Every structure is written in C-alpha cells, then in structure tokens.
From a paper:
Compound 3 appears to bind hBChE in an opposite way than hAChE: the electron density map of compound 3 clearly indicates the location of the TPP+ moiety at the bottom of hBChE active site (bottom right). The wider opening and overall volume of hBChE active site (500 Å3), compared to hAChE (300 Å3), allows the TPP+ moiety to enter the gorge and bind in the vicinity of the catalytic site. A π-stacking interaction between Trp82 and two phenyl groups of the TPP+ moiety may stabilize the molecule inside the active site. It is important to note that, in previous studies of our research group, both the fitting orientation of TPP+ compounds within the active site gorge of hBChE and their interactions with Trp82 were predicted in docking simulations. Missing electron density of compound 3 indicates that the piperoyl moiety is not visible. This moiety may be freely spanning outside the active site of hBChE. In addition, as usually seen in the X-ray structures of this enzyme, an unidentified 5-carbon long carboxylic acid is bound in the vicinity of the catalytic serine extending its alkyl chain in the acyl-binding pocket. Thus, the data obtained from the resolved crystal complex of compound 3 with hBChE is highly relevant for two main reasons. First, this is the first time the binding mode of TPP+ conjugates with hBChE is experimentally demonstrated; second, the data constitutes per se a validation of our molecular docking data obtained in previous studies. For instance, eqBChE and hBChE present different volume of the active site and exhibit three specific residue variations in the gorge site (Val305, Asp311 and Leu313 in eqBChE are replaced with Ala277, Gly283 and Pro285 in hBChE, respectively).
Numbering used by the authors:
A (entry chain A): 3 to 529
B (entry chain A): 354 to 529
C (entry chain A): 178 to 529
The structure:
Amino acid sequence: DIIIATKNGKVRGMQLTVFGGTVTAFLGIPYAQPPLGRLRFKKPQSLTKWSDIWNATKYANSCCQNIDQSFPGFHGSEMWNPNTDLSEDCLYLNVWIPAPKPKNATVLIWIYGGGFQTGTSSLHVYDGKFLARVERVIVVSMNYRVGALGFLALPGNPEAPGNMGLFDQQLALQWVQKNIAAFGGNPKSVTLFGESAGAASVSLHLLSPGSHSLFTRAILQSGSFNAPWAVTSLYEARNRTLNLAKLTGCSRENETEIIKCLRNKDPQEILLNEAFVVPYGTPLSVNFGPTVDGDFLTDMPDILLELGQFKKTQILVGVNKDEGTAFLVYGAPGFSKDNNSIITRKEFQEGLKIFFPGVSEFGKESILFHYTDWVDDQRPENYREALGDVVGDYNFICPALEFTKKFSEWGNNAFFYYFEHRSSKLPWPEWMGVMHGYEIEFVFGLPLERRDQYTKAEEILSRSIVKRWANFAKYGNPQETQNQSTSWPVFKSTEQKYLTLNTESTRIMTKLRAQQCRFWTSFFPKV
Amino acid sequence: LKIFFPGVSEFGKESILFHYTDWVDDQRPENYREALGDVVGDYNFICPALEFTKKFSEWGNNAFFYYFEHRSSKLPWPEWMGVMHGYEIEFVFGLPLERRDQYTKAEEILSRSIVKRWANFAKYGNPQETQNQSTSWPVFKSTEQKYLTLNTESTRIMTKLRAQQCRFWTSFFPKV
Amino acid sequence: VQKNIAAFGGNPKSVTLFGESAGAASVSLHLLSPGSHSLFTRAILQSGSFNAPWAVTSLYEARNRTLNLAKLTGCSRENETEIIKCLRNKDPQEILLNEAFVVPYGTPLSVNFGPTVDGDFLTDMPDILLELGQFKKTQILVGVNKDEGTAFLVYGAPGFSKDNNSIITRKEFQEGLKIFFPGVSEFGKESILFHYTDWVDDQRPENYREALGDVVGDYNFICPALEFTKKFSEWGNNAFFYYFEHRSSKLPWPEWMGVMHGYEIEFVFGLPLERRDQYTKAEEILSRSIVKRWANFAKYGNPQETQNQSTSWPVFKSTEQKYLTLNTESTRIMTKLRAQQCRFWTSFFPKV
Ligand SMILES: *[C@@H]1O[C@H](CO[C@@H]2O[C@@H](C)[C@@H](O)[C@@H](O)[C@@H]2O)[C@@H](O[C@@H]2O[C@H](CO)[C@@H](O[C@H]3O[C@H](CO)[C@@H](O)[C@H](O[C@H]4O[C@H](CO)[C@@H](O)[C@H](O)[C@@H]4O)[C@@H]3O)[C@H](O)[C@H]2NC(C)=O)[C@H](O)[C@H]1NC(C)=O
Ligand SMILES: *[C@@H]1O[C@H](CO[C@@H]2O[C@@H](C)[C@@H](O)[C@@H](O)[C@@H]2O)[C@@H](O[C@@H]2O[C@H](CO)[C@@H](O)[C@H](O)[C@H]2NC(C)=O)[C@H](O)[C@H]1NC(C)=O
Ligand SMILES: *[C@@H]1O[C@H](CO[C@@H]2O[C@@H](C)[C@@H](O)[C@@H](O)[C@@H]2O)[C@@H](O[C@@H]2O[C@H](CO)[C@@H](O)[C@H](O)[C@H]2NC(C)=O)[C@H](O)[C@H]1NC(C)=O
Ligand SMILES: *[C@@H]1O[C@H](CO[C@@H]2O[C@@H](C)[C@@H](O)[C@@H](O)[C@@H]2O)[C@@H](O[C@@H]2O[C@H](CO)[C@@H](O)[C@H](O)[C@H]2NC(C)=O)[C@H](O)[C@H]1NC(C)=O
Ligand SMILES: *[C@@H]1O[C@H](CO[C@@H]2O[C@@H](C)[C@@H](O)[C@@H](O)[C@@H]2O)[C@@H](O[C@@H]2O[C@H](CO)[C@@H](O)[C@H](O)[C@H]2NC(C)=O)[C@H](O)[C@H]1NC(C)=O
Ligand SMILES: CC(=O)N[C@H]1[C@H]([C@H](O)[C@H](O)CO)O[C@@](O[C@@H]2[C@@H](O)[C@H](O)O[C@H](CO)[C@@H]2O)(C(=O)O)C[C@@H]1O
Ligand SMILES: *[C@@H]1O[C@H](CO[C@@H]2O[C@@H](C)[C@@H](O)[C@@H](O)[C@@H]2O)[C@@H](O)[C@H](O)[C@H]1NC(C)=O
Ligand SMILES: *[C@@H]1O[C@H](CO[C@@H]2O[C@@H](C)[C@@H](O)[C@@H](O)[C@@H]2O)[C@@H](O)[C@H](O)[C@H]1NC(C)=O
Ligand SMILES: *[C@@H]1O[C@H](CO)[C@@H](O)[C@H](O)[C@H]1NC(C)=O
Ligand SMILES: *[C@@H]1O[C@H](CO)[C@@H](O)[C@H](O)[C@H]1NC(C)=O
Ligand SMILES: *[C@@H]1O[C@H](CO)[C@@H](O)[C@H](O)[C@H]1NC(C)=O
Ligand SMILES: *[C@@H]1O[C@H](CO)[C@@H](O)[C@H](O)[C@H]1NC(C)=O
Ligand SMILES: *[C@@H]1O[C@H](CO)[C@@H](O)[C@H](O)[C@H]1NC(C)=O
Ligand SMILES: [Br-]
Ligand SMILES: [Br-]
Ligand SMILES: [Br-]
Ligand SMILES: [Cl-]
Ligand SMILES: [Cl-]
Ligand SMILES: [Cl-]
Ligand SMILES: [Cl-]
Ligand SMILES: [Cl-]
Ligand SMILES: [Cl-]
Ligand SMILES: [Cl-]
Ligand SMILES: [Cl-]
Ligand SMILES: [Cl-]
Ligand SMILES: [Cl-]
Ligand SMILES: [Cl-]
C-alpha cells in the first residue's frame, strides 16, 4: 500500500506490473473544484483540503463532449472515444511514477488533443506506465474541459471569459509544481508534450506569461497555435456564443444573463447545439476553441510569435506523413475507408468546398493549380492523394514548420521530425497512409509490449523514439547516444534540417514541403 | 564472401560479415541476400566513386554526385536485384523518350530530365534543369557531401551517402 | 570540508578534487553528480575516468554479483532485504573472502564491486550524461602515464615476470588477450591483434611484450582519458592534458615496465623535494615544477609555471588536441596522443 501526502490531502495509488518490474499509478487525483452549477464556464477554482485518503485507483470521469459516431463498432474511430463516464465533474489528473520511487525524476506532462472539442487522458494510447517503467520518468496527464463548456467566450466577462480548458491545463501544471516533489519528481525538470489540439495547447503555454514558470521544455506533435483551426477569432467566438444562445432559448441582452440561462441547461442540451453554431461545419470543426481573452492570451498569438514574445527554451516539433487523410472520410464526396477512394477532378473540387467553405472561387482554384500539376496525367489516385496533401499541408505541416522557424529565429534549439511509419496494426486502409494520431502509440511505448502484435522493427522504432523523447525532456537534446544512431541536428531557419522516423533508415533531410508551404504560408493567407 | 574476396584473410572476411550483418530484425529471410549485394556494390563501386569525388573536389573543382534509384519498368532481371549496375545507361541515352518502346510516362519524364542535365553539364559545366521547377543540383564538397537522387517520384538532396559503410571500406579494409 | 575547513584557514569556495586511477574515476563522477556540484570548484584526473571500461559496473553485472556473493555465503533468500540482513551478520572476513569469486573470469585486479547507476549519486548511465553535457561546468586537468598497462601483465599474463625481461611469443600474446578480454569474441581479440602487431621490424624480440602492455594501457586508461577530455572540453570549459613519461630513478619494478601506472603520484605529492630521499636533482626539479602547476591549477584554474621560463601549457581543444609532456629532459607540446590506437578503441571496439 503506497500513500503519498499532497498539499491538499493524502492519495492512495496502486501498483502495476510492467515488463517484469513495477510502476505506481495514481489515477484520478482531483486538481480543481468541480466546475458545476454557478462554476460552469468559469476559470477553474482552487481545490480545498480533504482530510481522509483519496483513492486514486481508477481513471476519473471524462469531460462532456460529443463522441465520434461516424464508424460505430470500428476500432479505428472508437479507440479515440472516451472510455470513462462523461461528466462536468471531470477536472482530474493521473500520475505514473517508477518503482522504486525515484529521487528527482524528470516529469513529462501529456496534453491530449481532439480539436478542443473532444478527448480524455484515460485513453489506452496515452497510458504513461511504459514511459515510467522504461525511462524512469514521471508521467502526468490531465482532463481539461472541451467544447463550449471549456471554450465558450464573451471576452472580458468572467462568467464566460474564454480559454477555460487552457486554464484547467494551467492549474494542473501548478498542481505539479506544488506536489510532484512528494512523488519523487523534479518540478524544475517538467516537459509538456501533446498532440494535435494538445500540441496547439503546448504552444500556447509557451506564449502565456502565466504558464512560463510552470514548465521547462516543450514537445509539439502534429499541431501548433498558428494552425488555421487552432485559434477562434473574437468575432467568430461572439457569433458562436450568440448562436448557441438562440439555439437554446437563452438570448438575452444583459450578457451575463445569457450565461446564467446557459448555466441552467443540461449538459446534453449544450452539447447537442454546439455543432450548429457554425453555418458550414463538419464532425471535426473547432466550434469552440482558444481565443484572445486578454488573460491567458494577451494578444493575437501570431503577433507574439513574430515578435519573439514567448518562453525561451528548447522545443521538439514534428508531423506525420499523411496528416490530412483522416479528415477525408468525414464528409469529402467519393471517399470511404472501405474502398480505395479513387476520386475525380469534380470530386476533388467538391472536397475543396467542404474543407475551405468561406474561401473565394479564386482561392480554391489556386489550391487546385498548386496541387494538380501531375508527374503523370493518368495515375488514378492523383486527386485522392492531392486532396489529402492539401488538407495535411494547410492544417498541420506548413503551420508546424512556420512555428519552428519563427521560434528558432530567437536563438533557441529546435528539433523537427517527420514521422513516416505506418503501424502494422493500423485498422484504417492503406491508402490513408501514416495518419494523424498514429505516432502517439510509438511515443508512449505501446510496441514495447511484445504480447501486443507489433513487429520487431516497430519495437526497435518505439524504443528509439522513447529514448529520444526522454533525453529531450531530461537534457534538452533528443539523441539516442548508445546504439550508433543518426544524430538529430538542430533546426535552423536557414538550413531547415529535420529527422525522418521510420523502421528502415532514419535520415537527415532539409526543407520539408518547401514548395507547398511557400504557397500556404506566404500566398494563401492573402486570399 | 570467399568467391568475391578470394585471397583475403579469414579475419578480413569476418570483418565484412561483422559490418554487414548487425540486423535491424534477426528474422527477415532476405537479410543475407541483401547484405551480400550491398557488400559487393559498396566495395566495388559506391565507396570508390565517393572517395574519388571527395579527393577530386578537394583541389578546388566543382563536382556533382548522383544516386540513381529507379528500376526500369522493362527490366528483365528479377525484382530482388533492384536498380542494377548498367541500367541507368538507357535513361542517359534517352531510350525512354521513344514512346513506341514500352516505358512509362514517368520514365519518359525522368529520362528527359537526365538528358537535359547531362547536356547542360557538357555544354555549361552545371547539371541543372533550369526551366521546369526542378530540384537544383548542389556541388559536392568534402565537408557536406551533398548528392542528388534520381527517381521518377521525388528528386531529393541528401548527404553523406553510405557514410558508415564507406568508412569501413575506405579506411579500415585496405589494411587487411 | 564545506562546513569545517574555514575553521582551519581554508577557503571552501576554492576546493580542487584530485585523485588517481579509481580515485580519478571518482573525481569524474563527482563532476557528473548533482549532489557533489556545490562541494568543489575544479578537478584533476590522474590515470582514470568513469568512461574507462573497468570503472562502472552494469546493473546486470551488479545484480549477478550481489546474488553470487549471497550464494557463496549461504545468504540466498528471496525477500531481497533478507539477503542483506543475512549478509549483515557475516564477519568482514567472510564477505572479503568471497568477493573474488563473484565473477566467473577475473584476476587479482578485477573491479568486482564498483560504481553503478543507482538513481541517486548517478541518475543515468554516465556515458549519456557526458555526451549530452550534463555535468559541472569548470576547468579540468587530466593525464596519463606512458606505460599504464605494464603493471597488469605480471598479475596473470603467461610468460610475464617482474624478475626477467618477459620476452613473450605470439601465442603468449594471444593467451594474454584472453585473460584481459575474457568474454570478448574471437573476432574481437583478432581485431586487437591485427591493430597492435603490424611491426616496424618483424624480428624485434620484445614486439609482443610491448604490444600487450600498450593494448592494456590504451584500452583501460589512455583512450578513455582522452575521450573524456574531448567530450568535456566540447561544452566550453578549459581542459589541460598531460602525458607523464618519467621513470622514477628509485622504481623497484624492472625497466621493461617503463613509466608505470601509479608512479606519477610521488611527483605530484612532492616526495622528490626531500633531498634526503635518493631521488636525482632532475627529479627534484620535475617534482617542483609539477607541484607548482598543480597548485596553480587549484588556485587559479591554469596549470602554468610562470616564473622559470617554462613551456606554457595550452588548453586541450577537440580540434587540435594539444597536450604537455612531463619529463626531466625537455617538456614539449604535442598533438593527438595515440591517435590511431584510440580510433580503434573508441570508435570500432565498442561495437564488438
Ligand atoms: C479507499 O481504499 C481503502 C482500502 O482499499 C483497499 O486496499 C487494498 C490494499 C485492497 O485490500 C483493496 O481491497 C482495496 O483497494 C478502503 O478501505 C476499505 O474499507 C472497507 C469498508 O467497506 C473495509 O472493509 C471491511 O473491514 C472491516 C474490518 O473490521 C469490516 O468489519 C467491515 O465490515 C463491517 O461493515 C458494517 C458497516 O456498519 C459493520 O457494522 C460490520 O460490523 C462489518 O464488520 C468492512 O466492510 C476496510 O477498511 C477496507 N477494505 C479492505 C479490503 O482493506 C476505503 O473504503 C476506500 N475509500 C472509499 C471507497 O471511499
Ligand atoms: C453568424 O451567425 C449567423 C446566424 O447563424 C444562423 O443561426 C444560428 C442560430 C445557427 O443555426 C446557424 O447554423 C445559422 O446559420 C449566420 O447567418 C446565416 O448564414 C447562412 C449562410 O451564410 C444563411 O443561409 C442564414 O440564413 C443566416 N442566418 C441568419 C439568421 O442571418 C452568419 O453567417 C454567421 N457569420 C459567419 C461569419 O459565419
Ligand atoms: C467508395 O465508396 C464511396 C462511399 O459510398 C458508400 O460506401 C461504399 C463503400 C458503398 O457501401 C456504397 O454503397 C455507399 O454509398 C462511393 O461514393 C459513392 O459513389 C457513388 C457515385 O460515385 C454514389 O453511390 C454516391 O454519390 C457516393 N457516396 C458518397 C457518400 O460519396 C465511391 O463511389 C466508392 N469508390 C470506389 C472507387 O469504389
Ligand atoms: C552470473 O553468475 C552465474 C553463476 O556464477 C557461478 O556461481 C557463483 C556463486 C560463483 O562461484 C561464480 O564463480 C560461478 O561461475 C554465471 O554462471 C556460470 O558461468 C560459468 C562460465 O560461463 C559456468 O562454467 C558455470 O557453470 C555457471 N554457473 C551457473 C550456476 O550457471 C554466469 O556466467 C554469470 N553471468 C555473467 C554474464 O558472467
Ligand atoms: C620469465 O619468467 C616467467 C615466469 O616463470 C616463473 O618465474 C621465473 C622468474 C622463474 O623463477 C620460473 O621458475 C617461474 O616458473 C617464465 O614463464 C614460465 O615459462 C616457462 C615456459 O615458457 C614455464 O616454466 C612456465 O609455463 C612459465 N610460467 C609462467 C608463470 O608463465 C618465462 O619463461 C620467463 N621468461 C624469460 C624470457 O626468461
Ligand atoms: C458518478 C459517476 O460517473 N461514477 C461513479 C460510479 C457510478 O455512479 C456507479 O458505478 C454506477 O454506474 O460510482 C462510484 O461509486 C460507488 C458508490 O456509489 C458505492 O459505495 O458503491 C461502490 C463501492 O465499490 C462505489 O464506491 C464508483 O463505482 O467508483 C463513484 C463514481 O464517480
Ligand atoms: C533536484 O534537482 C534540482 C536541480 O534541478 C536541476 O535544474 C533543472 C533546471 C533541470 O535541468 C534538472 O535536470 C537539474 O537537475 C535541485 O535544485 C534540487 O535540490 C534536487 N532535489 C532533490 C530532492 O534531489
Ligand atoms: C575567502 O575568499 C572568498 C572569495 O573566494 C574567491 O572565489 C572563489 C570562487 C575562488 O576562486 C577564490 O580563490 C577567491 O578568493 C571570500 O568571499 C571570503 O570572504 C574570504 N574569507 C576570508 C576569511 O578571507
Ligand atoms: C445585469 O447587468 C448589470 C450591469 O453589468 C450587472 O451588474 C448585473 O449583475 C446583471 N444582472 C442582473 C440580474 O442585474
Ligand atoms: C540498444 O541496443 C540494445 C541491444 O544491443 C537494446 O537492448 C536497447 O534497447 C537499445 N537501446 C535503445 C535506446 O534503442
Ligand atoms: C519541361 O516541360 C515541358 C512541358 O511543360 C516538356 O515538354 C519538356 O520536355 C520539359 N523539359 C525538360 C527538360 O524536362
Ligand atoms: C520482507 O519484504 C517486505 C516487503 O518489501 C518488507 O516490508 C519487509 O521488511 C521484509 N522483511 C521482513 C522480515 O518482513
Ligand atoms: C625556479 O627556480 C628557482 C631557482 O632559480 C628555484 O629555487 C625554484 O624552486 C624554481 N621554481 C619552480 C616553481 O620550479
Ligand atoms: Br475555426
Ligand atoms: Br575492424
Ligand atoms: Br567490470
Ligand atoms: Cl512524402
Ligand atoms: Cl486531369
Ligand atoms: Cl517534400
Ligand atoms: Cl507560389
Ligand atoms: Cl542470423
Ligand atoms: Cl545510406
Ligand atoms: Cl569501422
Ligand atoms: Cl610513447
Ligand atoms: Cl611475428
Ligand atoms: Cl602516440
Ligand atoms: Cl581502425
């Protein structure tokens, strides 16, 4: 029986057997007042003392959210859906620590993604026990509020100021600063890591003065705040808060009374209407996301990035080879996960209208022009592949590269990767390639479990990624120093070197997607 | 090894085996097949060509290095033999420009680009394709050792071809 | 020392660690250990460093050896703590008597029980900490003696004796490799033989004798000390490297063993300054100069002798790799000590 005294109370954990060793897990420690009733839509409030022993032996509730129902019964989608009850009472975190208890272990804090509308830290692919066992780091992960309940904004109004889910994250970071030493952790060696909206989050913590003393270093997997989906404009946010009000019968004029009315609706009514606050939007649109609130975010983040107003530290950033393909089977005509989705020119153009809805005809023609000058006129998969690259370059790759360039220009070491291994177990079809989300299981070391159907080469790849991530967290340098590995060079805005991650040959390459990103980053923002 | 290195000591041959058989997976059936081909190709062609180019460029002259990795669609040898010795020649001489002759469209484009780069090298000392938004071919210098890959898909600038293998053949192996 | 040396007239902010062989390896681990960082200023490493092959016991070696010691003393249990409690009731002599046998193949000099990655003093494998710059940023002075390996040869290598000139044959050489590299493959040992036996003259009788000593000294001391110094200087700090090549006039070991492991120490501690004690005048001058350079290093971070028209000691940088030779005749600046040998031990041999 292992009991740790925290600043707010005792917590009891449980022992896990991992690779013939032991890991101690504390699942579901509360870190804030449950944001219920009058606390709905507000910043998270500090948690007051308890005097008994809190049993942290099961994952806690996941935050309320609309789940993915486009592929019922299919593991490729359902692996991302919440696996604990949904509840507004969801502000909990998880701690995995090595056994025996470490003396001053580096701490990895995971922030899940899911478009700021979904996600939970209890997913199988985020299980921190392998990292704790294999690299003797402490892994922490938190639930934070998503969708309108986490990001509804009336800027300036503390009844619904925006960015609440980011403040949830920030309060979990504070909890680690105050408490992880009792667990054997070093609060001066904390690395944030996250994927998709979790990476965008990590990048906003680099920008937020309130987060600067709460962590050391940062890892951004397939996301950054400058991605086009990651920050909601204050005009978008007001229109959407107001549309949600009308849709729920809560239109008022004392702005605070819209909020009080929204506070009496059941979670289900709020969730049901979230999808429709945007005139044109898909199962994946970021209806309620981060905003410039004047608190967490003091200015438009593109300005802060460009002018060097961010935490000066090392970053590790990267993207997967086929980021865009996942999005195509949620609406683009002609696409299906159950066939090879050979689409025509007309379907391609229709697909652009779905992914770029309020873009001019000329804007969409310019995309088509830049992605359809083929090397062979007659390859049937031309348009299929182009649409996926369009979506992936615009939404993930070019923003991640621009973030890394702009961040490194202020003097800090940055390391960039390109993950191009397709999991042997991937349940999605081969045409979707190296999908968004599917590096995570390598980062968390799932292929280290030989019982679990991965190949030997995937075991070696995950082992190497785990070591590089751990070395980055501990030492600020993502090398594998012992096994004659390719050395990972720093990314500099001139040479733009990056490391490819695959089972065969790991290589140093330069200027990823050079011609594509000049289109998205330089020209396209004008249209 | 005994056939390809006949008057080499037992230790010499063991050292080749040591440097080419530390597998990424113990159990891939083609491990030894692929290793023997790489042994023969690195010793006899690739490492000497790279060493020549380094030593020649060290005296001040522009050098350009390529790595040809396209397997001809018409190749009559089996797939396991890959991008064989001799089989870039037909691209250099422009045979795939003859549409009547069973090559793919991508091979026509590749041969056309190689022919232009060779011709530009002969005429101007610089193997660029300047008109069709092509990857620029950097000079090979003994420090950075940049080279151009030639294939139908994506033509890329890479660095330090066969670095670990050639340190074996060029630095150690001549001692045995 | 931090808490008490001021009462003795000492400056706790000017503390230099120095040590030799396992003591130098220790000094180098204090550079790596966060708990030691505020306890000293500067460091001197004489014939050792933690990256030497004998200096850090693997956690797998260490468990096997703790368990073998348990069986050998009748303390095998399964509550791990109860092995220890049982070991705590044995007499010191019983523990000591069984230490030698915890390793299947080992000599009077093997490091049966050494430093380990304990997660406390040592938070990670030290080679990783060195390579990634995780160590105390300060000046170091590092060096080695010309014949580090010879001492080990008379503790087991066949054909060797301190009481004759130990001319050994090829077969004895190969046998000697098996003693010094016991769990190394046949190919590994052949590769050592290949790199150390391409003679300048086929027929010099002492060829194999000299080669075996250089094998042992380069692998165990010189190449690790040079690699430590390169890797440490790459993070910005001044490092100074020496090569001690004076054979003590009083040395009781035979001349063929040369400038042995351990035999710079008496010069460092100034024993030849005692004229009553049978050293030559040149050895008095050499010890006096070494003592001044060591003291200047401790006090000022710079091992010069500034007053007597001495060779200036350059910093060691990973590009030029300059080092200072220490001898009674002529003290010289040289470059890239053991270049070809160390490329073998440091780059190739760890693969075998
Ligand atoms: C938080 O966890 C603790 C401990 O959790 C356990 O610890 C590990 C080591 C394993 O043993 C796992 O089983 C658990 O994870 C919880 O403490 C348990 O509380 C129960 C109460 O339900 C206790 O069990 C029984 O013990 C007493 C011994 O005297 C019995 O007498 C009790 O039965 C009585 O119930 C009647 C109620 O009026 C009473 O009048 C009768 O006379 C009857 O005898 C009791 O059921 C025991 O203290 C713990 N259980 C175990 C297996 O150790 C703690 O409850 C958890 N906190 C929660 C759930 O909020
Ligand atoms: C800002 O919101 C208005 C209103 O949105 C409508 O009402 C909401 C409650 C919700 O159900 C939305 O889906 C509705 O669209 C948007 O105005 C609508 O725009 C569409 C197409 O442009 C049009 O067909 C509707 O008739 C409009 N409805 C009204 C009431 O004007 C408006 O487009 C939003 N602004 C932006 C920039 O998207
Ligand atoms: C691939 O499938 C899409 C999706 O169609 C659905 O899923 C299929 C696997 C099958 O079960 C169909 O019955 C389903 O309707 C096909 O897209 C449809 O294409 C035709 C015309 O092209 C028509 O039925 C619909 O308009 C399309 N439906 C959607 C949702 O786009 C597509 O044609 C298939 N492509 C190939 C190459 O087989
Ligand atoms: C790990 O230890 C085993 C056991 O060591 C033996 O028992 C000890 C108490 C001690 O007396 C040692 O000297 C013994 O050797 C090693 O296994 C032995 O290996 C040798 C040669 O390889 C063999 O002849 C013995 O029969 C083995 N004995 C047993 C009990 O298995 C083993 O080699 C050690 N591991 C390593 C990597 O050295
Ligand atoms: C040098 O001496 C070694 C050691 O032999 C012992 O010490 C000698 C000084 C002398 O007192 C001997 O009687 C001792 O046995 C000699 O090594 C021996 O060599 C012969 C065969 O070569 C044989 O007696 C033993 O196998 C060896 N013993 C050992 C312990 O190695 C060596 O031959 C002498 N070399 C020279 C050049 O004189
Ligand atoms: C509130 C929620 O989402 N989940 C609860 C959980 C469920 O409500 C319950 O399992 C029915 O679905 O109930 C938890 O608490 C239980 C107590 O009500 C009771 O003492 O019986 C159980 C004893 O084992 C248990 O403690 C749970 O099962 O953990 C609490 C959880 O938040
Ligand atoms: C734990 O370690 C602390 C020092 O942390 C160091 O600095 C930060 C920035 C990281 O880079 C980390 O890896 C370093 O070790 C000490 O100040 C503290 O006293 C230590 N505490 C315990 C209990 O060991
Ligand atoms: C002793 O000297 C102290 C200063 O030490 C200085 O700094 C360290 C880092 C060394 O380089 C040392 O040689 C320097 O002199 C003073 O702070 C202290 O007050 C002094 N105390 C007495 C009693 O003189
Ligand atoms: C109405 O608006 C005023 C002014 O902002 C505010 O003080 C008040 O709390 C709001 N609600 C009510 C019920 O008065
Ligand atoms: C390095 O290789 C060893 C086997 O030689 C393996 O056990 C270990 O997991 C590897 N380490 C990393 C970090 O890949
Ligand atoms: C360049 O492209 C044109 C068509 O746009 C083609 O006809 C020509 O052969 C190409 N030239 C080279 C050198 O590849
Ligand atoms: C036996 O093992 C337990 C568990 O580690 C430990 O608490 C105990 O002190 C050990 N010894 C005895 C005598 O119980
Ligand atoms: C320098 O030379 C003088 C004599 O000229 C001698 O007494 C002194 O010991 C020497 N000092 C050093 C540091 O060698
Ligand atoms: Br948006
Ligand atoms: Br070799
Ligand atoms: Br050892
Ligand atoms: Cl690609
Ligand atoms: Cl077309
Ligand atoms: Cl590219
Ligand atoms: Cl452009
Ligand atoms: Cl094999
Ligand atoms: Cl290569
Ligand atoms: Cl080599
Ligand atoms: Cl010498
Ligand atoms: Cl000989
Ligand atoms: Cl030398
Ligand atoms: Cl060599």
